[PDB]
Amino acid sequence: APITAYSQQTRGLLGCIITSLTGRDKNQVDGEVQVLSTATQSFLATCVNGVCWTVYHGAGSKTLAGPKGPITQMYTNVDQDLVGWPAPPGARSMTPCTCGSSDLYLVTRHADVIPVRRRGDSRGSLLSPRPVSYLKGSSGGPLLCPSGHVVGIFRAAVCTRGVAKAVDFIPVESM
């Protein structure tokens, strides 16, 4: 692929449950994509223009643990399945695509970078299909064009019989 990615974990359980409860995260925040957890689920946020964006089926209407206590959504749009918090200092903010490319790259929670064919405003097909369990936890993850700009964030897999062949996504125009 043309983009590479790696993860670095920042907390595990005890730190997780304790920080959701308290709402204060003193950790140093880095990188273009935040890995997120709540009690029940796991998902991604993509930093675009100073907003951390993720899927409403994952964050609900929750605050995001921050340096100075819990951070309030500044964007909450249930039908689009989109929410937005002002990104914490440290986040690497990315930029909206304008090249209109149809070669896209999905970045997953594991930092794989997998090729996607843009098919509509909000649909993209996996060039090589994957098991759906491999995309699990990756909602909110970025779809990249080949110069590394946001075309959208990952919403849901389209899957028959446990293999994922396409993906719905929230097109960055929505953000």
């Binding site: 990615a5 920042t10 959701s20 950790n27 273009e32 929750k62 995001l64």
Partner: peptide, 12 residues
Amino acid sequence: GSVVIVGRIILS
């Protein structure tokens, strides 16, 4: 109950 940054992905 607040969402928590449990890790991050660095882009290249």
